[PDB]
Amino acid sequence: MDALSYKTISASKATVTKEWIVVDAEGHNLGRLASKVAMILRGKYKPSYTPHVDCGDNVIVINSEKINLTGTKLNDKIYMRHTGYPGGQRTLTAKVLQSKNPALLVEKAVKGMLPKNKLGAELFRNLNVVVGSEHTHGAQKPRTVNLNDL
Amino acid sequence: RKRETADARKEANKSIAFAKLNNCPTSPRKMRLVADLVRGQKVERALNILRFSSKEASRKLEKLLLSAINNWEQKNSEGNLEEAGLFVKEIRVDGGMMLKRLRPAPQGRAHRIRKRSNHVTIVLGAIN
Amino acid sequence: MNLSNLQPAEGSTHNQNKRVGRGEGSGKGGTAARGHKGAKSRSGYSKKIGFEGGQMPLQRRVPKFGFKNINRKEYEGVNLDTLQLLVDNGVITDSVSMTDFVANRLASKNEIVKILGRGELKAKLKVTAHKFTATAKAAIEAAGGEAVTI
């Protein structure tokens, strides 16, 4: 009979407000930036976060070509890409992978810190990883956010 | 409740025109194939489809529709038939009482064979 | 009061609904009351009384002893205490014969009575019995009349 009389209001799709955050990845470590990017994408810096709603902002990383790894990880980081056929386990390297589409580094770093669900596959579509220094969104008026102010 | 009152209230079939085909020695799964092509069509397109269908389940279904048309003409005596523009509102193919026979399988055993029947019901409705 | 208000004493009636093997929830269900498998859980099990598992029972490890006399004469046994308690509540006066023993349910019709000497008989009586004891005769002949053997 709805005997609660005091409920916790959860945000809906008609009440959320998505922003267009732009993040500069010039001086930043891969995982150290990807953690904050994934937290912003999921949406947890708003005091209205509902776990089942696609809250949060849309992140545009604008310097992914200028990211760096700490140790000899650029030469000793391996990515496994098994295909499904017998003997089809392919291994890449962090140095070879950034030679073609360097945005894949940040893309695969962010994909993995997400809830791994339908909500979490729909959150990956809000992340735009640009290899250059200028995006192609244009008439959206995105604001720059420094990850050191969170 | 008074059963005569309930029956007099339920006897509202003086307007709806329908037709039934009971105890047809054909399986329902094979007539439900031709009922889907007729369901919702016009009263003449349905007749053409049933007359040119390559199924033995249509030879006795094409005249049930004619009987339904005749029942509609009987109920709506005052008025012609082509101005109304009849169609096939609803058509349902139900099951029926099946006969059970035996077939001698190899090595001294017997299998069962069920000769199935089906009931067909059709209502016309009008566009006007 | 009436045939529609019959009520027995509190505690004379009981459950009468207790049946064994009527589902889990009434107690005895499933393996009804016999635990798990074994000879004591099979239909038709009966405990062999003398059986001791396979070894020699006590009713067979102990020797037999004694015999039975065919001419055993067993007397009834009446005490001076009972005689005095019977003479206090006046039913017998100055003569206790073999008839006052049957009229007071002390001996059967055709039996033999022996007067024992457990009591403190004080009244003067003239008893007629089959046998006497060294205490009963000495306590009767000294504290009252005679004691004749019949």
Binding site: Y6, T8, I9, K44, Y45, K46, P47, S48, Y49, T50, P51, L150 | - | -
Partner: protein, 113 residues
């Protein structure tokens, strides 16, 4: 006399099957499949009631953390300074304030900070 429990035998299972309304497949009409599904549903309903009380506290804590990190603070420090100040407001009310009344939330934060 011969006693047959024919009517109540089925009246008892109708009531247990009427709560398996909306189940996929034969779990809603077949008796020996519905009874096996209603009991497991009640077993699942007994629990998740202890979990509804700790899944909402997590949401309250997350919302309080989000509302407190907007003022350059953290949930741990905020809760420490609130508990060692004589306030005694539960996380439900604190999250409701952080979500609906940001002015009241920041007033509480400035008072305890």
């Amino acid at each position: 006399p011969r006693s047959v429990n024919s009517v109540a035998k089925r009246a008892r299972r109708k009531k247990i099957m009427k709560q398996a309304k909306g189940f996929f497949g034969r779990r809603k009409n077949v008796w020996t499949v519905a009874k096996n599904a209603v009991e497991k549903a009640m077993s699942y309903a007994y629990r998740d009631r202890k979990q509804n009380k700790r899944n909402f506290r997590s949401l309250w804590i997350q919302r309080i953390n989000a509302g407190a990190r907007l003022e350059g603070m953290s949930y741990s420090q905020f809760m420490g300074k609130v508990k060692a100040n004589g306030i005694e407001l539960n996380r439900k009310v604190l999250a409701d304030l952080a979500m609906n009344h940001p002015e009241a939330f920041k007033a509480i934060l400035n008072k305890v900070k």
